[PDB]
Each structure stands twice: as C-alpha cells, then as structure tokens.
Scaffold this active site. Structure first.
Site, PDB file in Angstrom:
ATOM      1  N   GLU A   1     -17.991  -4.191  10.635  1.00  0.00           N
ATOM      2  CA  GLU A   1     -17.260  -4.021   9.483  1.00  0.00           C
ATOM      3  C   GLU A   1     -17.543  -4.957   8.333  1.00  0.00           C
ATOM      4  OE1 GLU A   1     -12.733  -4.468   9.315  1.00  0.00           O
ATOM      5  OE2 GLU A   1     -12.696  -2.149   9.262  1.00  0.00           O
TER       6      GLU A   1
ATOM      7  N   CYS B   1      -4.534  -1.055   0.657  1.00  0.00           N
ATOM      8  CA  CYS B   1      -3.562  -1.729   1.416  1.00  0.00           C
ATOM      9  C   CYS B   1      -3.475  -3.380   0.805  1.00  0.00           C
ATOM     10  CB  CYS B   1      -3.568  -1.700   2.623  1.00  0.00           C
ATOM     11  SG  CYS B   1      -3.550  -0.113   3.656  1.00  0.00           S
TER      12      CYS B   1
ATOM     13  N   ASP C   1      -8.458  -7.696   9.137  1.00  0.00           N
ATOM     14  CA  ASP C   1      -8.261  -8.167   7.966  1.00  0.00           C
ATOM     15  C   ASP C   1      -8.397  -9.686   7.626  1.00  0.00           C
ATOM     16  OD1 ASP C   1      -7.970  -5.582   6.749  1.00  0.00           O
ATOM     17  OD2 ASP C   1      -5.870  -5.375   6.885  1.00  0.00           O
TER      18      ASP C   1
HETATM   19  N1  LIG Z   1      -7.517  -2.815   5.938  1.00  0.00           N
HETATM   20  C1  LIG Z   1      -6.306  -2.269   6.126  1.00  0.00           C
HETATM   21  C2  LIG Z   1      -6.331  -0.898   5.937  1.00  0.00           C
HETATM   22  C3  LIG Z   1      -5.499  -0.069   6.256  1.00  0.00           C
HETATM   23  N2  LIG Z   1      -4.234  -0.650   6.920  1.00  0.00           N
HETATM   24  C4  LIG Z   1      -3.039   0.178   7.503  1.00  0.00           C
HETATM   25  C5  LIG Z   1      -1.781  -0.210   7.135  1.00  0.00           C
HETATM   26  C6  LIG Z   1      -1.095   1.022   7.263  1.00  0.00           C
HETATM   27  O1  LIG Z   1      -0.642   1.180   8.718  1.00  0.00           O
HETATM   28  C7  LIG Z   1      -2.185   1.924   7.009  1.00  0.00           C
HETATM   29  C8  LIG Z   1      -2.172   2.602   5.535  1.00  0.00           C
HETATM   30  O2  LIG Z   1      -1.040   3.675   5.521  1.00  0.00           O
HETATM   31  P1  LIG Z   1      -0.084   3.611   4.352  1.00  0.00           P
HETATM   32  O3  LIG Z   1      -1.062   3.835   3.168  1.00  0.00           O
HETATM   33  O4  LIG Z   1       0.698   4.868   4.505  1.00  0.00           O
HETATM   34  O5  LIG Z   1       0.616   2.310   4.143  1.00  0.00           O
HETATM   35  O6  LIG Z   1      -3.535   1.588   7.265  1.00  0.00           O
HETATM   36  C9  LIG Z   1      -4.281  -2.297   7.300  1.00  0.00           C
HETATM   37  O7  LIG Z   1      -3.497  -2.397   8.237  1.00  0.00           O
HETATM   38  N3  LIG Z   1      -5.241  -2.912   6.776  1.00  0.00           N
END
Ligand SMILES: Nc1ccn([C@H]2C[C@H](O)[C@@H](COP(=O)(O)O)O2)c(=O)n1
Ligand SMILES: Nc1ccn([C@H]2C[C@H](O)[C@@H](COP(=O)(O)O)O2)c(=O)n1
Ligand SMILES: Nc1ccn([C@H]2C[C@H](O)[C@@H](COP(=O)(O)O)O2)c(=O)n1
Ligand SMILES: Nc1ccn([C@H]2C[C@H](O)[C@@H](COP(=O)(O)O)O2)c(=O)n1
Lengths: 246, 246, 246, 246
Positions: free
Chosen positions: A60, A148, A179
């Site tokens: 990633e 996010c 992350d």
């Molecule tokens: N780098 C990221 C990308 C996405 N999400 C996760 C958070 C949520 O579980 C989902 C996004 O859904 P929503 O847009 O409904 O919050 O993806 C995350 O934790 N980290």
C-alpha cells in the site's frame, strides 16, 4: 504543553465496555458496529486489535508513492476491499500519496515543509487531504469513496514534531493499523527532510495524536474485542476463538 | 458511545498550569503565547476566559449570513482585527457563512443535510470548511488569512446530534467564544431543518466536541489566566487587575 | 513451407505511411506513438531505424548470462530506462537469461534442446518466457515490467532451424535492435549445441520470424521515421535533423 | 494500423501448393503432414477445409465453461481424440475455459478485462494460456497434451477490439474450426462485458489475427486439399471423393 490524552490501552477498554453493553450502530452495509464518537488518543501502539501484516502495508505504501488513483496499480493482486469501493473504471479518491505529493492537490507535503522550514513555531503547518468537492466526488463513476482523512497538522515544540491526525471515519482493525503505518512514515520523512535542510535543527519525531469522528469495529471483528475482554490478548485466529461472536 | 472528554473547567486548569510553568511559545507577530497542542474537550460552556459580548457575535452572524468575503460588509464599524488581516481590496477567506452556504464551496450545509436526512446513521455527514488550495490562497492580494476551521462533522446517535469540530488554530479568549456561538447556531439550525422534514425524528442538539491543533492564549490576555488562577473568576477588567502580567 | 512474410523494408514503409497519415495512439506515459498491430515479418535486417550500438548489446548479453533479476548487475552504469522500470529494491522480471536458463523458470533452453534432440520434426520445441502469474507479477514491489516476450518456438526443416518469436509489445528503435541481437545469439547457440551432439546433423540457422502484438515507435523517435521517409536513410543524428518532428 | 495480412483464401492456396509439391513432414505418430511455418493471417472465415459441426463445438464450449480438466466431463460421449490424449485418470491440460477463468491460472479473463477497462489503449491486455512448467506438465500421468495456444492479446483501436492469437501448433481441419469458434466466443464476450461497464464505450468486435508456429494438415485429410485444388469446393464426403489421396 501536549494534551493529556487517552492511550491505545484505554481505547481498548472503552471498546470492550461498548460491546459488553451492546451499544450497537447499524452500518450503511446493514451490518452492526460498536463505536466511539469524537475519539482522541495518543497512538502509542501501532495497532489496537488484530495482527501486524507488514507485507500488505508495504504494498500500500508503494501504491501511495506511485500516486495512482487506480486500484489495479496496487502491487500484486488488488485486495477485494479496494475492488468493491472502486469506480466502473477502477478509479478511487483515497490514494494518500496523491493527496500529499500531487500538484493536483496543491503540493501539500512541499508547502507544509516550506512553511515549517521558514517558521518552526508555525500553526499553519498542515496537510489537507479532503476537499469541498468531496460532497460530489465520493461516488464519481459509481465509486464509493468519501475521503476518511481530513487533515494532518504538524507542530514543532521542544525540537519534537507532533502530528495531529484528524479523521472522519476509521476502522479499528484494518483501518488504524494501515493508516498509522502511513502517518508514521510521513512523520519520519518530514523530520528527515527538515534535518537535511539544516544540521543544527536536530528535530525528533514526537507524538501522533489520533482524532476520529467515528472510531468503529465491524461485527465480523467483534470476536477480537470479546477475546481481548476475556483474556487480555489482542489477537486470536478466528478458528481458535470460542465464544458467542462466532 | 461518546468519548470521555475534558470539560472547559479542566482546560482552564491546564492553561493555568502552562502559565505557572512559563511554557511560552513565540507567535508569528513576535509575541508570546501559552498553548495546548492536540486539545480535545466537550464545549460545555460558551467561553473559557473573558466576557460574553452578544452584540459583536450578532454582527458577525449577520456577516456570515451575507456570505460576503469583504470585511467592510460586517455590520457597522469593521473591527481592526478584521482590517489588519484583510487584503488590499478588503478581502478575506474566513467567512464561515460563505464556507457552508455558498455554491462556490460546494454547498456544504445542504449536502450534509441531504446525507443525514437519507441515512441518520451516516459517518459521511460533514461540512468541509478548508480546501487544498489554501496552501496558496491564505495570502492572496496580501491578506493573511489561513482558514482556522478545518471540518465539522455531525453524528446522530440516540436522537441527539453531536458536532465534532476540527480546528487548526483557536484563540482561547476571542476566537473560541465567537466560534462556539457560530457552531452552536449551525447545530441548532441543522436540528430544526431535520425535524421540519419529518416530525417523527424528534432530534435534539447533543454535544459539541472541540478538537484544536493549537489552542492558545496571547500574552495580552495572560492577566485573565493569572487572575483566574488566583481567584477563580473567569473575567476581570484590565483596570481592576493587579499582578505581574500588567 | 515457410510463410511468405513481409521484410524489414516493408515494415519501414508501413511505419512511414502511418506517420504520414497521423495514425497516433496515446502511450501509457501520455506520449504519442505510431503502431502496427499484429505485425509479422522476417527479421532479415538487424535493426529497423537508428544505429547499431554493439557496446550496449554486449553489456545486456552479459547481464542475461548472469541471470540476475537486479538491474544494478548490468555491467557498468545501469541505463536509466532500466532504472525507471525497476522495483524499490532494484528488481525486475525481464532478464531473458533467467527466462531461458534458470531452473526457476523450468529449464526452457535445456528442455527445448532435449525435445529437438530426440525428435527433429517436433512442433513442441519451444521456450516459454512469460507466465500466467505475470498478471500480478508485473508491478511487484513497484516495478513496472510486464514481460514483452511471450514465447519463442524452434522448428527444424530442411536442416535449417527457424525461430518464431512471439512478442506482446516491441519498441521499433531500441527494443527490436536489442531483442534481435538476443534472439540471434540464442538461435546460433541452439544450432551449435545440437550439432555438437551429433556431427551428422549439420544444422544451419534459418529464418527468424518476428510476430508482434503492438509494434510501435515513440514520439521522440518520429524524426527517424520522417527522415527515412524523405531521404531513405535509416539514421540521422538528432542535431543534423531538420523537419517538423523537432 | 492493422497489418496487411493474408486471408483464409490465400492460406488455402499455399496449402494446395505445398501438397502439389509434395512438401511433406513426418508427424510424431509417424504419419505425413503438409505444413506452413510461421503462418499469419486474418481469420476472415470460420473454417479452412471441411464442414462446420455446430453440435460438437457447443459440447466443447460447455466443457470449457465447466473448467474441468477431465475429458469424461465433455457432454455426452467423449470423442476418441480426447480419450487417446488423456492421462491414466482421464485428465488433460488443454481446457481453455480453465485457462482463462480458473483462479488456478491466475484469472486471465478478469485481469485482462480490468486492464482494458482502466486503459483502453493498453498493450498489456493479454490472456496467457500456456505456462513455463508445461515443459514437464505435458505428459503428467501419461497424458500427451502440450498446450497448443500460447497467448491471446486484445487491442482496442478505433473502438474495435482486435484479437491476436498466438498458437504453437494448429490442425487446419478440426483444430482451427473449433479453436476459431472458441476465440470468437471469447472476443464477443469481452466486448459485451466492456460495453456493460460503460455505455459510452460502444466497442465492437474487430479482427482476429491468427499466428501459428506450425499450421498443418494430416495425411488423412489430404483428399480435402486435393479436391479443393481441383474444383474449388472446401468440402467433400470421403465417399464421393475420387483422386489419389484415397
Ligand atoms: N484509510 C482508510 C479508508 C477507509 N477507512 C474505513 C473507515 C470506514 O469503515 C470506511 C469508510 O466508510 P464511510 O465512508 O461510510 O465512513 O472505510 C479507514 O478506516 N481508513
Ligand atoms: N475564526 C477564527 C479565525 C481565526 N482565529 C485565530 C486563531 C489564531 O490565533 C489566528 C490565526 O493565526 P494562524 O493562522 O497563525 O494560526 O486567528 C480563531 O481563533 N478563530
Ligand atoms: N525487451 C523489451 C522490453 C521492453 N520493450 C518495450 C516495449 C514497450 O515499448 C515497453 C513495454 O511497455 P508495455 O508493458 O506498456 O507494453 O517496453 C521491448 O521492446 N523489448
Ligand atoms: N486446441 C487444439 C489442441 C490441439 N491441436 C492439435 C494441433 C496438433 O495437431 C496437435 C498437438 O500435437 P503437438 O503437441 O505434437 O503439436 O493437436 C489444435 O489444433 N488445437
């Protein structure tokens, strides 16, 4: 002074308390979650529940470096989670390398570096991931990808560089682990680049403060929380697990 | 569950501790500040130190409602703080009414209302104030105005709407009082509009959680912190004050 | 009978016709190309446009012999074209020596030799370069290297050994010249090794038939095609060139 | 531009010439063949010599769709040609449905679809049938099945999708007719799937270019070539035939 924040251990405890009390919230997919709203803690551990997969994180990272907005450019076989969220042409929004290194997103890394290089005490050292048009962009061509991460601010105090990470939404199990690896990478990078500009700076990586609107666990990972609650172990194989979260 | 946050009373205590220990940081104007990095607290009072001036807040509300990016359009005499930060034509960036109600900033209020009206449980209910191009826009035509509010997210849980406010930078004395009045206004508005769309919703205003990259007091307001530390009074007249912060 | 194929001269003519008609196709790098699809010709000349650099070809032969998948092992200074295509550890896929002599790729040279040694008329004398996992391998660790050669089959008829080269993608200017040097080398090698096994065989190198999915010239080499079209010379110095392809 | 290739009518002519001149080559079974080496032609007819048997082709399509590597799973009575080539347990290698749709062969169809959906101009749009280990796999458990199709590449130019088919070995009479029906099927499928992903694409099936290492006729079908040479009819009943190829 840096604020007296929760640690990852205390976050674990509150997530266990939430499951204990059946404080469930229905996800957009229709599945259940437990959740802390307005979470703020020092990321003093590289994961909360689950196991570290350094292999995936590196794939990633390489995708982030390429700055590509197409999920097929993820090295090797693309994770299905990235496939289901992608547009009809395989496009997404949330490549974090594009967010901080692309000139299309206004050179966030370079501009924050220049800001902090000119004034170490600045409150304007910030990398802005999200954008106002995200209200319309999140489902372009049928993708489902509303950024996010909102912003990451960098503050140099006592020769340490602290990151304040502001997220809208973060999955506890896969999200936070991946992350955090990323945010730690970028913080180390920034420290290197500032030190390389002036050898008398001698900056050190400080604390990463994690701020999340909705910090949540999905139902398929409830067994991890349950097991930790009983035993104090932050990981089990799904096969070795025994309890009501099957 | 909503996280177990600090309250305003505890923030007061930490600021009083920072001043006691002479934990000073030099502002860009060259003046000293005390400061809490990565602050997170429930805004359970409408101010921290100082007095409430409902007259000024109302004039700034009217300016936000006009959505004007020119400081002369602030009703009455434009405050000097707004004059010294404006461009050569009197222009700025940080009209928050423009930010949430202008179509130029992609209709933040309306889109967050449509999201929350369609899925009350959404984690995507957010108003994005700042923008990637702010890296270049903050000093356009010689203004000095780098957007202090990043994002405000809204989460409906147990029929209460909680606001999570993410700020880059916030002055404790003037900034927080004015900004809180604004965010309270918008939260109340959102509740009203959602309730007007369906009478069975019966939503209520929840908690406002305040997340600040740098929450600071300027040296000219140190006498307020000092006086509170000694007496417990959150306000004095500068004339009635006696102590070493003159 | 061997098929009545185009020659290199006729390929030159069709490439000139394509440029004349502005039949351009946009490369993945964003740059323009002209192109023949499903090209098939006898490689009766060692290059199409440009000059022969026997020095570079020999360095690449030595790298092929080492069977190394790391571009730093190319003798001397590694060409930048090999650097930009390599992974984050300096690794690639397209070492053709590894492809035909490594036991990791199932001993392609040796097995084809044994096949043809046992039955000279065999239709199964083939060296398989590419692999099904290439769908996932081409960007391992951030490399960009999808094997361009698919297979080379060898057919012994009238005591001559003909090679049928099947490529996915071949650059006319650098690609074909280097790749042909290689395929000619391997054909000569195979003839030697079969003759050394039995002195009554008396095999001779036959024709190399070149089959290419996309045979293309990049825009930076358009001046070579243009100049040949006007003058009939297969090479000019870029400095001596005059015309619209600057 | 698409290369100026031979057509099926010209291939017929060259095969008729090879027979006229007694250009024979001895097959591995000990029987004679005529043969064109390095054949390349546009498949602009669905057969070369013989008759179309849509019944058999449909049964073989159903077998490919099952992805079964066992010849008994061919609907109805398994043809003897498939029996004599199968292993001691009835296993083979050359189920082309397995080749393009099995995850065991790395998802050839799906990956080529994802590539072409992301970049219509790609030169990397390819389905890899054969594999390096085929050097050892061709006679596993006593089967005799060395994969005849190497690769099929797909190139989208002028909104038409051209297929470039690379075969090692192809029988003119039975092989080409069955194999063409298969490749036509897959090309039509790919067009449909790409068009279903985006209605503005409007792609159409282009040319199928046939590249064969050894394109041959067995001695038992010489009477077809001979009859066509004399009369121009591409088919006779073996009973109605009169001539020296009995
Ligand atoms: N780098 C990221 C990308 C996405 N999400 C996760 C958070 C949520 O579980 C989902 C996004 O859904 P929503 O847009 O409904 O919050 O993806 C995350 O934790 N980290
Ligand atoms: N609505 C606003 C706008 C600005 N500020 C204050 C915070 C800082 O004291 C200053 C901005 O300075 P900087 O951009 O250097 O943070 O303005 C604030 O508190 N709230
Ligand atoms: N031995 C090689 C290796 C590579 N290429 C060229 C063909 C294309 O110009 C490019 C590969 O790009 P793609 O994978 O996009 O075809 O490299 C070549 O001609 N010969
Ligand atoms: N789909 C297939 C499978 C096989 N063959 C034919 C070509 C040869 O006549 C024989 C394989 O023999 P060899 O492996 O000796 O080429 O089978 C074919 O035409 N098409």
């Amino acid at each position: 002074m840096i604020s007296d924040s929760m640690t990852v251990e205390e976050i674990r405890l509150h997530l266990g308390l939430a499951l204990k009390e059946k404080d469930f919230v229905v996800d957009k997919t229709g599945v259940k979650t437990i959740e802390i709203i307005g979470a703020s803690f020092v990321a003093d551990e590289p994961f909360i529940f689950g196991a570290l997969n350094d292999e995936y994180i590196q794939r990633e990272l390489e995708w982030y470096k390429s700055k590509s907005l197409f999920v097929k450019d993820i090295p090797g076989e693309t994770p299905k989670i990235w496939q289901q969220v992608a547009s009809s042409k395989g496009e997404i929004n949330s490549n974090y390398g594009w967010a901080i290194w692309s000139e299309d997103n206004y050179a966030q890394y370079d501009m924050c570096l220049a800001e902090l290089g000119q004034n170490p005490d600045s409150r304007r050292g910030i990398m802005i991931y999200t954008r106002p048009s995200m209200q319309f962009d999140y489902n372009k061509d049928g993708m489902s990808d509303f950024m996010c991460t909102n912003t990451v601010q960098y503050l140099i105090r006592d020769k340490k560089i602290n990151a304040v990470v502001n997220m809208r939404s973060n999955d506890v199990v896969f999200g936070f682990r991946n992350d955090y690896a990323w945010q730690k990478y970028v913080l180390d990078k920034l420290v290197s680049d500032l030190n390389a500009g002036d050898s008398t700076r001698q900056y050190k990586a400080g604390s990463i403060i994690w701020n999340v609107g909705s910090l949540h666990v999905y139902s398929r990972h409830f067994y991890l929380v349950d097991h930790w609650w009983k035993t104090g172990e932050t990981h089990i194989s799904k096969k070795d697990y025994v309890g009501k979260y099957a």
